[PDB]
Amino acid sequence: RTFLNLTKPLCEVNSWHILSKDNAIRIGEDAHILVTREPYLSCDPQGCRMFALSQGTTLRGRHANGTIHDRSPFRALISWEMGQAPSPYNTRVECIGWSSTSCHDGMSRMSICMSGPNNNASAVVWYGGRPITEIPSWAGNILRTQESECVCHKGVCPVVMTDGPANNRAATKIIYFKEGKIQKIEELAGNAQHIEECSCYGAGGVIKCICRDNWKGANRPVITIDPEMMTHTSKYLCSKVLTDTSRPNDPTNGNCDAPITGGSPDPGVKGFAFLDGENSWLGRTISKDSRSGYEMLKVPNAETDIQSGPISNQVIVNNQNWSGYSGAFIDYWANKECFNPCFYVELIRGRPKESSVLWTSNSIVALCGSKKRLGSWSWHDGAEIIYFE
Amino acid sequence: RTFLNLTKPLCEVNSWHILSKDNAIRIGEDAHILVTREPYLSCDPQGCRMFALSQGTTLRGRHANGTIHDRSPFRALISWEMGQAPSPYNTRVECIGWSSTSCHDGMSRMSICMSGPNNNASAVVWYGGRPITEIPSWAGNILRTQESECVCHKGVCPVVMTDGPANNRAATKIIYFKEGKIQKIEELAGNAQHIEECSCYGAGGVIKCICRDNWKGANRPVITIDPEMMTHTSKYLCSKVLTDTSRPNDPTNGNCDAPITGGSPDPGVKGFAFLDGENSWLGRTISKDSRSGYEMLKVPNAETDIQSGPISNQVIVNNQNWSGYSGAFIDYWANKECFNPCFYVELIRGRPKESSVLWTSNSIVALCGSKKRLGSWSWHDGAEIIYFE
Amino acid sequence: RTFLNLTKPLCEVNSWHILSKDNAIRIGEDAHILVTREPYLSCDPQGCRMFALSQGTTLRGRHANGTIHDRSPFRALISWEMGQAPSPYNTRVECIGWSSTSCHDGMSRMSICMSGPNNNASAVVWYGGRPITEIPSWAGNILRTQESECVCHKGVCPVVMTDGPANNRAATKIIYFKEGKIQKIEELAGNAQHIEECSCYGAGGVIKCICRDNWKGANRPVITIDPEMMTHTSKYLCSKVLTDTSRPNDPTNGNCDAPITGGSPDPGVKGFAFLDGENSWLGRTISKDSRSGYEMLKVPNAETDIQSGPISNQVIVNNQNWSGYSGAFIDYWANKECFNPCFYVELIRGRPKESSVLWTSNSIVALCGSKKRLGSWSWHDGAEIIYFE
Amino acid sequence: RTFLNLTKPLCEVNSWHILSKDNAIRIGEDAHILVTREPYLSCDPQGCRMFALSQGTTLRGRHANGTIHDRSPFRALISWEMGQAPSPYNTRVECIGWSSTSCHDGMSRMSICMSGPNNNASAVVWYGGRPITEIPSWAGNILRTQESECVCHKGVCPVVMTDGPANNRAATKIIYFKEGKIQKIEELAGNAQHIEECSCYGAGGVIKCICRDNWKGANRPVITIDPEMMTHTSKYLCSKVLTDTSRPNDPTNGNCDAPITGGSPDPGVKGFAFLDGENSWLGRTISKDSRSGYEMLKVPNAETDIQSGPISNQVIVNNQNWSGYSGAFIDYWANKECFNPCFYVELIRGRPKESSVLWTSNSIVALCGSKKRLGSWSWHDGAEIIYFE
Ligand SMILES: *[C@@H]1O[C@H](CO)[C@@H](O[C@@H]2O[C@H](CO)[C@@H](O[C@@H]3O[C@H](CO[C@H]4O[C@H](CO[C@H]5O[C@H](CO)[C@@H](O)[C@H](O)[C@@H]5O)[C@@H](O)[C@H](O[C@H]5O[C@H](CO)[C@@H](O)[C@H](O)[C@@H]5O)[C@@H]4O)[C@@H](O)[C@H](O[C@H]4O[C@H](CO)[C@@H](O)[C@H](O)[C@@H]4O[C@H]4O[C@H](CO)[C@@H](O)[C@H](O)[C@@H]4O)[C@@H]3O)[C@H](O)[C@H]2NC(C)=O)[C@H](O)[C@H]1NC(C)=O
Ligand SMILES: *[C@@H]1O[C@H](CO)[C@@H](O[C@@H]2O[C@H](CO)[C@@H](O[C@@H]3O[C@H](CO[C@H]4O[C@H](CO[C@H]5O[C@H](CO)[C@@H](O)[C@H](O)[C@@H]5O)[C@@H](O)[C@H](O[C@H]5O[C@H](CO)[C@@H](O)[C@H](O)[C@@H]5O)[C@@H]4O)[C@@H](O)[C@H](O[C@H]4O[C@H](CO)[C@@H](O)[C@H](O)[C@@H]4O)[C@@H]3O)[C@H](O)[C@H]2NC(C)=O)[C@H](O)[C@H]1NC(C)=O
Ligand SMILES: *[C@@H]1O[C@H](CO)[C@@H](O[C@@H]2O[C@H](CO)[C@@H](O[C@@H]3O[C@H](CO[C@H]4O[C@H](CO[C@H]5O[C@H](CO)[C@@H](O)[C@H](O)[C@@H]5O)[C@@H](O)[C@H](O[C@H]5O[C@H](CO)[C@@H](O)[C@H](O)[C@@H]5O)[C@@H]4O)[C@@H](O)[C@H](O)[C@@H]3O)[C@H](O)[C@H]2NC(C)=O)[C@H](O)[C@H]1NC(C)=O
Ligand SMILES: *[C@@H]1O[C@H](CO)[C@@H](O[C@@H]2O[C@H](CO)[C@@H](O[C@@H]3O[C@H](CO[C@H]4O[C@H](CO[C@H]5O[C@H](CO)[C@@H](O)[C@H](O)[C@@H]5O)[C@@H](O)[C@H](O[C@H]5O[C@H](CO)[C@@H](O)[C@H](O)[C@@H]5O)[C@@H]4O)[C@@H](O)[C@H](O)[C@@H]3O)[C@H](O)[C@H]2NC(C)=O)[C@H](O)[C@H]1NC(C)=O
Ligand SMILES: *[C@@H]1O[C@H](CO)[C@@H](O[C@@H]2O[C@H](CO)[C@@H](O)[C@H](O)[C@H]2NC(C)=O)[C@H](O)[C@H]1NC(C)=O
Ligand SMILES: *[C@@H]1O[C@H](CO)[C@@H](O[C@@H]2O[C@H](CO)[C@@H](O)[C@H](O)[C@H]2NC(C)=O)[C@H](O)[C@H]1NC(C)=O
Ligand SMILES: *[C@@H]1O[C@H](CO)[C@@H](O[C@@H]2O[C@H](CO)[C@@H](O)[C@H](O)[C@H]2NC(C)=O)[C@H](O)[C@H]1NC(C)=O
Ligand SMILES: *[C@@H]1O[C@H](CO)[C@@H](O[C@@H]2O[C@H](CO)[C@@H](O)[C@H](O)[C@H]2NC(C)=O)[C@H](O)[C@H]1NC(C)=O
Ligand SMILES: *[C@@H]1O[C@H](CO)[C@@H](O[C@@H]2O[C@H](CO)[C@@H](O)[C@H](O)[C@H]2NC(C)=O)[C@H](O)[C@H]1NC(C)=O
Ligand SMILES: *[C@@H]1O[C@H](CO)[C@@H](O)[C@H](O)[C@H]1NC(C)=O
Ligand SMILES: [Ca+2]
Ligand SMILES: [Ca+2]
Ligand SMILES: [Ca+2]
Ligand SMILES: [Ca+2]
């Protein structure tokens, strides 16, 4: 048992294989399944787990009514064995609140949750199942974090947090933890103008976080973090293949150093990419407008070339089915010479897109890279909304 | 691996951070959640667990009818992983009965339950999951104990017990256990006139128990225990800030050595305080009359100064919501140089305050100290009683 | 870690303290609780567990209809953590069948289940969770065994089994196992005329089995086993205090060497006693006729004195409540210089005594000896049959 | 802990003892039990587990409607403790998809699942709970595998897979894995004309797979694999006792090297045999037309003699009850000098044979060899379909 070091490069990825699916809404139609949203996965030396923010109610429960609402005192980060659906019986409460991240440093798991009212939220930082550090809101406006896993190197686990407006300049910080204790705090530097919901992964001693600009950009901000020097830079994804939602049509050229405006009607969604020269993959919703469908696009030099476009594609969720947030994770403890990219897609069901029920929840699908050329189908949620009416 | 020794001082506390919330009533509206009351938490080298007295029925079950009643042969002390709701599937039966305490001595857990008829109750003392000692009623009138954790030092774990009237002088004893075996029994001495439901914690080699005087005082009794000499003293919290329920208005001065009487309509509720000079915090219900709301008040020198008043406050449960019992615990095994105060509030739902249902149950919230100035919100139970009608 | 040796004497017993109660029928009115009967408890170095024969249906399930029937292909021996109720989610399947015993030898657990048709049943003998031995019926008429725990000494676990009529002479054998393998088989010898459902315990290198004579006696047969020599003797309890059900009134004198006959309308019930000279306790139903109530009677010299009567009594279940089978077990791994007697009472609900429901099931209560004089109350099942109508 | 090798002979078998039965459909009438089909068992050093393909819904759930369908994105291979019924709360997701195999090599478990559309399926090969290898469809027509356990020798675990028509010549391959990595791929050789759903076991350093010819043969193909040389041969079972369903009446002679045509209306079912000279047992449905009943027949020299007929029988499921798939497994880690044959029968309930419900699911029974002459009875599912109407 030892601290994870980010000593490996990313594996070559030519297609995506199925890792896990929990079928939570199908199962939750009859079994005692918690209402969730903002799911993710995170691994440790022993295996991988599913994570999400509970709403503190089952899906068929009367208290599912009103679960469109993002923030309440009844939310908590919960984790469970990958592939099961989240029930009150198989879930571990990681921390209490309505925004989270989690990661394993090789020794123990750090989990962070924000809670409180909009103007006075706070984070509690847990390590090894115990509370270590507390962080008060610095801007008084929904202190919040990644909603997917953080990444650790030599015990140092950077986390990106934001406090301030969703629709204007906000105060983003990079906090570097070790065993749950703050080693350093940096204010966001560089050319990213707005940061939400970073999706992060590590390779070759570098952590890259692909985020959501909720203010201006339909191109995604990219934060590049050195966990040894505990320093960073920021800019935007260069590619013309825009990957936030909502977004306009892809332009003839991207923009590395400024947000590309447009899209309607949504200011953003959490998403991700793996950036590795030729071996670069962008996720996005198939719909330009709404959280519908999900596709993976291989976009060589997306990080550096404004003219970069796709050379291959894999549909993950067809555009007749609802998607949601998406994020990066890696099983850093696999028995491989390279770190293999993985991602999840949150499959949102109910409100607001499906108004015939009173609730909002999700299920999860996760995939990882293959070097092979694998066939694919749509991994949509699979529940029949009419059964809940 | 070794006995806990209470070597460390209390941590400085300037505000309270969220630790856990189980949302039991919300979840139990649909899932199979046991009816409980008199909850608490207690930790050990590996972590913390929730505890409560089951009523031997689920909340939606027909047997939840009648659960306002305190004592039956169907009650048991159960424990479960912190943050989960208590189901028939995830709970450990610690012992059988209708009054309890539990604590870990660093080696194993001691749990104690009283059971039987009012005039012929008995305690069974468990250690490491096995029954060790039994104690018959000495006064033939509801032998009973703390309803929150005990505290251990060098393997010696004092427990405060009462047998006798709830509304007149009773027979309290302090029993000092080691590995579940009685080392010494003392009769209550000093100026406290009636003792119930002690909330106890340890720091700097001293155990302090903040109790309920059900006979006279709206100020709370304090028993100070030397766990090495196995002796004690008792008196009242000195502060004018009265912290029982029901209580009168706070007087000009409190009284260290006698009860401050008054209030209506109820003679008491279990509560707690942390007493450490300037670093002193008193919990109480927001209402003077009813078990509604919950507030933490920083009252420097509350233990010693009859003129001591609050210098800061944090609302835990707003006064539009039901509270209940409250009690102390500490994660004595944290990786900190001090022992950090924690507490829980029982959030009672149903009878008698909510008579539209046939049951009485609760959920739990728990918080611990922070040296930071954290923002706060209300951690009320969150269930809609109309859903249960 | 080491084979159990039955070195220790029995502890002095002056009253009985509560050990466990599962409240299964109360809980199972709403939660998913298996239908059972023929429960018992059995301990091991780590803890104690509850055992019973499942009916392969939940209590509220439609397949609970018809569960008065004793033998089907849908029964199995299940175990679970002591104090929980048996659900499909918390139970281990020990073996498949409709008659059972189980014991731990200090290293691993031996479990035995008989299954098959009446004329051609077979036992499968499991050790450490694997099947070791199979035993075909020797008399073609419901091969069957203890329905409570067996006892082990230096790795040898004797088990009493019967094959043959329930209402005439049958063929009983004592089979001596080690690691699930047959070391020796003996035909029953001595003065017991019929043997069913032995309740066995060890002390001072001797195993005593207190059984049910279903053919003649309302006095209980006693088999005394030497597990080192692998030999035995049999006779009847001497005491005039008759402990089977149905039974006649206690006569002036019992009979050590022949059945005391009579009683109406039923030929027997599984029960138990602890026999240790002056330190002897007999359990029985309070009703002479029906499986109603339960009482413990201290009967000095019950094993040797035909005139021995009770000097003490403790009501375990009041005579307004249903009881059932009862049996012996001991935590042989307690940290005590003596082995402390324990017993359970099966609390049968439903048919045939409560014919307003279509099912038969039970809950469990268990108690162990105290040297103190503890108060007592009735530990009846506690479910309202009306809720099941 | 070492790699398993197969250098023990098969135990002598004269009858079959009950190993496990989950009663899933009875329990699932009113507990949260997943809809499954294609079950099996597989063992490891610690014990044995049940496996099946979930349909990603509970049995009583509305999504159970339409579970006759074999392939969907909502299916997964799940495993659970032997004898329990499969719930969302007690099941481990081994991999995602709609055809599987699994086996333990002595060190870790390999699990394989195929998923995707009919024309573009792919296998993901897991080892020790992590994805190792992916395999694309080679024939574009439902890449698929055994639906019962594989077998490992000195690290090498062969797996039989088919891709191609169910009703014409297909492309079968034997893939040899070590720690989930491909060691070798072979195309099917020999005289078997079509291969589905192989049931495999090892003995004497050889793996024998008894399979389903879905194209022509009512006699079952037999593939003999040497896991050291990593080569194989194939032919048909010689015996005149035909063991596929549907099948004609048994002829006066079998055929070792060609399919025997006939039977109506169905082309095949997964089944199994143990082939060991005089010690040979064949399973089959009792009905020659339908998946009803199940019988074991001892057919000396079934593998080599076209005139070989039964010398003994045991009815496992009576012919008034539904059966289904059946397959081989062995506890290779038992404490015996020989490998004892075990098998399971899938007990299918619902569609198409029971059209009064909207679903298709199963329960499991499993039996192992005995050298004794044990009595038998029918181990049918035991649910009443009307309870589901
Ligand atoms: C088994 O399953 C596997 C796994 O899924 C399947 O393999 C897959 O096979 C397909 C072909 O069948 C390959 O498709 C290739 O994808 C790339 C990239 O495509 C993405 O980007 C395109 C451009 O997008 C930008 O630009 C457009 C405007 O131009 C904007 O609208 C966009 O917003 C972007 O800004 C885009 O058009 C593609 O859309 C398609 O996919 C999406 C999902 O992402 C769908 O929703 C759409 O409906 C649509 O289908 C996509 O987003 C293309 O570049 C490839 O085109 C080349 O190849 C074609 C032949 O395959 C050929 O007709 C084209 O003219 C073009 O040819 C050029 O390049 C070839 C090399 O690729 C040369 O050979 C050729 O000579 C020439 O120079 C192609 O469309 C998948 O990548 C592949 N995936 C994997 C993971 O292997 C397989 O099909 C399955 N088999 C069966 C039997 O089902
Ligand atoms: C207590 O338990 C023990 C142990 O379980 C049990 O022991 C069994 O005892 C019986 C004797 O009572 C044994 O039965 C023997 O079985 C031999 C094989 O029988 C099978 O094969 C027969 C031939 O099948 C082929 O040929 C026919 C055409 O001829 C064709 O239809 C078939 O398809 C196939 O090609 C078959 O007829 C027979 O069918 C019976 O069983 C099936 C289920 O398998 C059932 O569906 C049928 O309705 C029918 O019952 C069977 O499938 C058989 O050869 C053997 O008979 C020879 O010896 C007997 C002596 O008893 C002579 O009378 C006779 O002339 C034969 O030469 C005999 O019938 C069985 O093997 C024991 N099993 C074991 C596991 O030990 C006891 O019976 C139980 N006791 C009680 C009280 O119940
Ligand atoms: C982010 O959240 C922070 C954490 O909660 C919050 O920081 C808080 O800031 C407030 C506002 O500045 C501070 O308030 C200060 O509190 C002290 C102490 O107040 C308490 O005691 C007094 C006196 O009570 C006694 O006397 C009266 C009779 O005069 C009796 O009625 C009473 O029984 C006692 O005998 C009391 O008057 C106060 O009453 C307030 O609070 C209670 C709840 O506890 C309410 O029910 C009541 O209606 C009223 O609101 C109180 O009980 C006071 O002396 C100061 O003058 C000042 O009010 C908090 O202490 C401070 N807390 C912490 C932990 O830092 C931030 O404000 C917040 N930020 C934003 C933007 O929201
Ligand atoms: C706190 O709880 C304590 C624990 O329960 C309790 O202490 C108990 O106190 C009582 C009252 O002092 C003591 O009772 C004594 O018991 C002995 C033994 O009595 C038992 O056996 C006799 C004889 O039965 C045989 O002979 C008769 C002939 O008539 C036959 O019927 C019978 O079949 C036998 O052949 C029997 O008469 C007694 O009957 C009583 O109890 C049964 C239940 O067991 C009832 O069903 C029945 O109606 C009747 O009440 C009994 O079975 C007796 O000889 C003494 O004279 C005296 O009765 C308990 O022994 C004692 N127990 C212990 C464990 O210490 C405290 O009383 C309680 N305190 C308070 C305040 O409640
Ligand atoms: C990751 O790196 C840290 C730092 O290199 C490792 O901790 C080291 O422990 C080994 C023990 O021999 C030494 O090689 C290093 O000098 C240690 N360095 C420090 C500063 O502690 C950790 O072991 C590494 N993890 C892995 C998997 O190799
Ligand atoms: C869903 O939640 C809404 C919001 O609470 C419920 O609307 C309330 O219904 C109650 C009882 O009828 C009324 O007293 C309130 O006036 C309503 N509140 C609001 C804000 O409308 C609604 O009933 C819930 N739906 C269901 C089916 O439970
Ligand atoms: C309980 O089980 C009994 C026995 O199976 C059921 O009674 C049978 O019902 C069938 C079908 O309607 C009748 O034709 C049989 O003749 C009945 N048998 C007997 C012995 O009465 C009964 O319906 C079941 N009850 C419930 C509520 O499920
Ligand atoms: C097959 O596995 C068995 C069991 O591990 C191996 O058994 C050992 O055989 C050697 C001689 O080759 C003995 O010295 C060991 O004591 C045996 N161990 C046991 C537990 O029996 C055997 O070697 C293996 N054979 C191969 C070819 O791998
Ligand atoms: C079971 O599923 C079937 C198949 O989806 C349902 O039948 C369909 O109902 C839809 C919606 O009303 C109709 O438009 C179609 O005509 C039906 N399709 C088919 C193939 O029949 C059926 O209603 C479902 N039953 C239940 C009780 O859920
Ligand atoms: C039990 O008996 C053995 C003899 O078989 C003896 O050596 C040992 O001391 C005893 N074991 C224990 C646990 O006392
Ligand atoms: Ca945006
Ligand atoms: Ca009071
Ligand atoms: Ca009798
Ligand atoms: Ca065929």
For residue D314, report the distance from its CA to the centre of ligand 2, in Å. 8
Q: Cα D103 to the chain's mean position, in Å?
A: 12
* Closest CB from C63, C88, C135 relative to D384: C63
Task: Give me the torsion for CA of D22, D23, D24, D27, rounded to 10°.
Answer: -130
> Which of C55, C130, C185 is the best substitution to test chain D (most D C-beta atoms within 10 A)?
C130
What is the number of alpha carbons within 13 Å of residue D207 lying toward its C-beta?
Answer: 31
Is C71 annotated for ligand binding?
yes
Kindly list the domain boundaries of chain B, sorted by start residue. 1-389
- Could you confirm whether A70 is annotated as catalytic? yes
Nearest chain B CA: its distance from A14 CA (Å): 41
Report which secondary-structure segment, H or E, holds B296.
strand B292-298
Catalytic residue among B176, B236, B325, B332: B325
C81 class by beta-carbon count within 10 Å (0-12 exposed, 13-18 middle, 19+ buried): middle
Within 10 angstroms of residue C50's Cβ, the number of other Cβ atoms is: 25
Catalytic residue among A70, A226, A250, A305: A70
For residue A257, report the distance from its CA to the centre of ligand 11, in Å. 15
Cβ-based contacts of B90 with chain A (< 8 Å) = 88-89
Q: Please say whether the beta carbons of A9 and A366 come within 8 A.
A: no
Determine if the peptide bond prior to A308 is cis (ω within 30°): no
Q: Looking at D191-278, list the stretches that DSSP marks H as alpha helix, in order from N- to C-terminal side.
A: none
Q: Do D57 and A30 touch (CB under 8 A)?
A: yes
From the CA of B367, the nearest ligand is: 3
Q: In 3D, which of C267, C107, C126 has the Cα closest to residue C193?
A: C267
D12 class by beta-carbon count within 10 Å (0-12 exposed, 13-18 middle, 19+ buried): middle
* Count of residues making up chain C: 389
CA–CA separation, B291 and B345 (whole Å): 11
The reply to whether C17 touches chain B by the CB within 8 Å rule is yes
Report which secondary-structure segment, H or E, holds A25.
helix A24-28
Q: Cα C207 to the chain's mean position, in Å?
A: 15
Phi-psi region of A143 (alpha: psi -120 to 50; beta: other; left: phi over 0): beta
**Which residues neighbour A230 within 8 Å (Cβ) at sequence distance 6 or greater?**
A156, A158, A176, A183, A184, A186
Q: In 3D, which of D72, D71, D67, D89 has the Cα closest to residue D80?
A: D89
How would you classify the pairing of strands B312-322 and D122-127?
A: unpaired
Task: Give me the torsion for CA of D366, D327, D55, A57, rounded to 10°.
Answer: 30
Is A9 annotated for ligand binding?
no
Ligand 4: lining residues by beta carbon, under 6 Å: B 119-120; C 15, 241, 250, 286, 295, 297, 309-310, 312-315, 373, 375-376
Instruction: Pick the residue from chain B with its C-alpha nearest to A61.
Output: B30
What is the token pair recorded at A38? 């903002």
CA–CA separation, A279 and D172 (whole Å): 34
CA–CA separation, C71 and C53 (whole Å): 10
| Amino acid type, D320 | Q
| Amino acid type, B24 | A
Number of H helices, E strands in chain D: 1, 23
Could you say which DSSP state residue C156 is in? B
Residues A1-389, CATH architecture: 6 Propeller (2.120)
What is the token pair recorded at D186? 């072979």
Q: How far apart are the first and last CA of chain D?
A: 50
> Which of B30, B34, B46 is the best substitution to test chain A (most A C-beta atoms within 10 A)?
B30
- Could you confirm whether A105 is annotated as catalytic? no
Q: Residue B274 pairs with which residues in a beta bridge?
A: B281
Tell me the technique behind this structure.
X-ray
To one decimal place, what's the resolution in Å?
Answer: 1.5
Q: Cα C121 to the chain's mean position, in Å?
A: 21
The reply to whether C116 touches chain D by the CB within 8 Å rule is yes
- Cα angle vertex B184, ends B183, B187, to 5°? 160
What is the number of alpha carbons within 13 Å of residue D237 lying toward its C-beta?
Answer: 35
Q: In 3D, which of B84, D29, B89, B30 has the Cα closest to residue A59?
A: B30
Q: Looking at chain C, list the stretches that DSSP marks H as alpha helix, in order from N- to C-terminal side.
A: 24-28
What is the token pair recorded at C179? 């690691």
Tokens 């003995």 label which residue?
A: D203
CA–CA separation, D102 and D150 (whole Å): 6
Q: Is the CB of B310 under 6 A from ligand 3?
A: yes
Instruction: Pick the residue from chain B with its C-alpha nearest to C373.
Output: B136
Determine if the peptide bond prior to D136 is cis (ω within 30°): no
Is A37 annotated for ligand binding?
yes
* Count of residues making up chain A: 389
The SS3 call for residue C224 is strand
Q: Give CA separation, D125 vs A338, D135, D175, D196, D231, in Å.
A: 18, 8, 11, 19, 21
Sheet with A273-274, strands from edge to edge, namely A273-274, A281-284, A292-298, A312-322
What is the token pair recorded at C132? 């070791």
Q: In 3D, which of B296, B300, B301 has the Cα closest to residue B285?
A: B296
Q: Is the CB of A7 under 6 A from ligand 5?
A: no
Phi-psi region of B179 (alpha: psi -120 to 50; beta: other; left: phi over 0): left
Q: Please say whether the beta carbons of D134 and D123 come within 8 A.
A: yes
Q: In 3D, which of B229, B227, B251 has the Cα closest to residue B237?
A: B251
Instruction: Pick the residue from chain D with its C-alpha nearest to C143.
Output: D375
Cβ-based contacts of D339 with chain C (< 8 Å) = none
Determine if the peptide bond prior to B246 is cis (ω within 30°): yes
Q: Give CA separation, C310 vs C239, C258, C279, C281, C282, in Å.
A: 10, 21, 12, 9, 9
